[PDB]
């Protein structure tokens, strides 16, 4: 059936389903810019997508780390 | 003696002269010797193209 | 254009050892292509080198057995960009062998 | 609910001590996920997540302390 | 194995409760090692490795606790 | 076969994933050093060096995490 | 023959199980000491030192557990 | 005769016999540089030597600490 998925997987995937298609949009913007690097409207378009992508990946991974640290501290008190 | 145990034998490798040292009774030494010469043989050569 | 080229290299190291004693021989050397002038190209060079590692054994048949590691070749040199030296120092390969022989 | 001990009571007193943080943090999570570049949403999330972290840590150490007191007393019945 | 104790059973409950994580981390590594610079692959691998860590850890603490619960009982047989 | 542990395997996955990077990154430098002012050479070398950097980083952090998961279990034998 | 008990048999199983690690560690150390700045030597030393550490830990933890099992039986002869 | 030395000392000393002369090179490089602190040929050299020295010391101390923790963890089981 569907592959198994924990709690951290879900907290991660809430971003991949929140930013609807940014992962495609960035590759489209790069394929258009590489065609003619000297178009102001293309450079202006690409700057925004690249910045948004950067921030998205940062917020995702920092949140996964924080939850992994809240869990390990409880698991340690079982002993 | 003839009824000494098999577990008393000791073998020590001595590569300096490519030889073995064996400690035991006479009959044990004899059997060990026979086994040694039943084990070592000159390997064949093989060539692969 | 028509061109013909032929080349030949022979090398032979000698090492002294004692029965059952492991031994190694290791060598490296460089050669310079004398293409010469003041309005010259940079003097190109090639470097060749060899390892032997060995362990010998005497067999009562009057045969010698050796465990052998052999490494040989010459150093990969993209920097020798020149076309003008078609008289390049001969490109041998690089080779590793390990085996036992009697 | 059907059966609960003293440790369960100590624990539950935090789960009711914080009224709604348990939902607020999941709510803010997806508000942010919809628009991860909004400064106001980021600042709103950072504090709710910090408060959730401290809530869980404070909860667990207390339950351990009480377990060690009770085990220490029970050891002397013999 | 043919014979399976109580601690065996409790250990195995985790191994069957995580359906195939033991495989998902292996093949996620196989993909990432092939292209260490793809952010999509790094972001996947971080999650699967963390989940594998918390699983292996809690399995062992739980078995330790159940061992001590009843090592303390068989001490009173005498 | 040669003796190798589990950390050795996890490590060698990367070395066998990056087929030839270890040599390419050297040859690129050898060429660049011959004429530092060529922009095409500079451009190539930048990308190669960056890939080698990330490869070594990921390789080390993963080994560390598996060392810790092992040590945690070993501790509980007693 | 040097007399060996049971504990020194269990202990020896690890020694012969890790065939060559004991020497691989020192070889890797002498290379690293010959050139500390080489990353290819560094990343090879990390895996061996970690394998060694884990090996020694598991070994002694197991020996201790067995000694406890035997002392608990000998206590019942009286 | 010579002072007694333990296993940790043999390990620490390996590095020092490995870097034959770095301890001196790092001094003389500094005195050349400080005599004329504006020559790029002296500066590029010193950058290298100082980096090598840093990595050397830092690797030596971490190795000694790991071997300490292995031994303290074995001795903890004698009791």
From Swiss-Prot, chain C:
Source species, domain of life: Bacteria
What is the consequence of disrupting this locus? Answer: Insertion mutants are hypoinvasive in the HEp-2 cell assay.
Q: How does it assemble?
A: The core secretion machinery of the T3SS is composed of approximately 20 different proteins, including cytoplasmic components, a base, an export apparatus and a needle. This subunit is part of the base, which anchors the injectisome in the bacterial cell envelope. Forms a stable homooligomeric complex. The complex is composed of 15 subunits.
Q: What is known about what this protein does? A: Component of the type III secretion system (T3SS), also called injectisome, which is used to inject bacterial effector proteins into eukaryotic host cells. Forms a ring-shaped multimeric structure with an apparent central pore in the outer membrane.
Task: Give from-to of the shown chain within the full protein.
Answer: 359 to 460 of 562
Q: Could you identify this protein by its name?
A: SPI-1 type 3 secretion system secretin
Species for this entry? Salmonella typhimurium (strain LT2 / SGSC1412 / ATCC 700720)
- Localization annotation: Cell outer membrane
The family line of this record is: Belongs to the bacterial secretin family. T3SS SctC subfamily.
Curated annotation (Swiss-Prot), chains D, E, F, G:
What does the record say mutating residue 77 to A does?
Abrogates host cell invasion and effector secretion
Q: What is the effect of changing residue 24 to E?
A: Has wild-type invasiveness
Q: Which organism is the protein's source? A: Salmonella typhimurium (strain LT2 / SGSC1412 / ATCC 700720)
- Its Gene Ontology biological processes? protein secretion by the type III secretion system
Q: How is its activity regulated?
A: Binding of bile salts, including deoxycholate, to the PrgI:SipD interface may inhibit the T3SS function.
What does the sequence similarity comment in the record state about its family?
Belongs to the SctF family.
What changing residue 75 to K does, per the record, is:
Shows a specific deficiency in the secretion of the translocase SipB/SctE. Retains the ability to assemble needle complexes, but is not able to invade cultured epithelial cells
Instruction: Name the reported effect of residue 14 to A.
Output: Can only secrete early substrates such as InvJ/ScpT, PrgJ/SctI and PrgI/SctF. Can polymerize into filaments in vitro, but not in vivo. Cannot enter cultured epithelial cells
Misc. remarks from the entry: The levels of PrgI/SctF are reduced in an invA/sctV mutant, probably due to protein instability, and are increased in an invJ/sctP mutant.
So what does mutating residue 75 to A actually do? Shows a specific deficiency in the secretion of the translocase SipB/SctE. Shows fully assembled needle complexes. Is able to invade cultured epithelial cells
Q: What is its main location?
A: secreted
- Under which name does UniProt file this protein? SPI-1 type 3 secretion system needle filament protein
What is the taxonomic lineage of the source species?
Answer: Bacteria, Pseudomonadati, Pseudomonadota, Gammaproteobacteria, Enterobacterales
């Amino acid at each position: 059936a569907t592959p198994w998925s924990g709690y951290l997987d879900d907290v991660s995937a809430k971003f991949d389903t929140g930013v609807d298609n940014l992962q495609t949009q960035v590759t489209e913007a790069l394929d258009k810019l590489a065609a003619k690097p000297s178009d102001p409207a293309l450079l202006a378009a690409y700057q925004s997508k690249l910045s948004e992508y950067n921030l998205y990946r940062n917020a995702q991974s920092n949140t996964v780390k924080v939850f992994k640290d809240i869990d390990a501290a409880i698991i340690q008190n079982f002993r | 003696k003839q009824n000494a145990a098999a577990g008393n034998i000791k073998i020590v490798a001595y590569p300096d002269t490519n030889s073995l040292l064996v400690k035991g009774t006479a009959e044990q030494v004899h059997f060990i010797e026979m086994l040694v010469k039943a084990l070592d043989v000159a390997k064949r050569h093989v060539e692969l193209s | 254009l028509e061109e013909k080229k032929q080349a030949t290299v022979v090398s032979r190291p000698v090492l002294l050892t004692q029965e059952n004693v492991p031994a190694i021989f290791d060598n490296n050397r460089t050669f310079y292509t004398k293409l010469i002038g003041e309005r010259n190209v940079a003097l190109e060079h090639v470097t060749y080198g060899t390892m032997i590692r060995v362990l010998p054994r005497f067999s009562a048949d009057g045969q010698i057995e050796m465990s052998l590691d052999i490494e040989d070749g010459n150093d990969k040199t993209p920097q020798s960009d020149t076309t003008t030296s078609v008289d390049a120092l001969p490109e041998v390969g690089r080779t590793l062998i390990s085996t036992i022989a009697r």
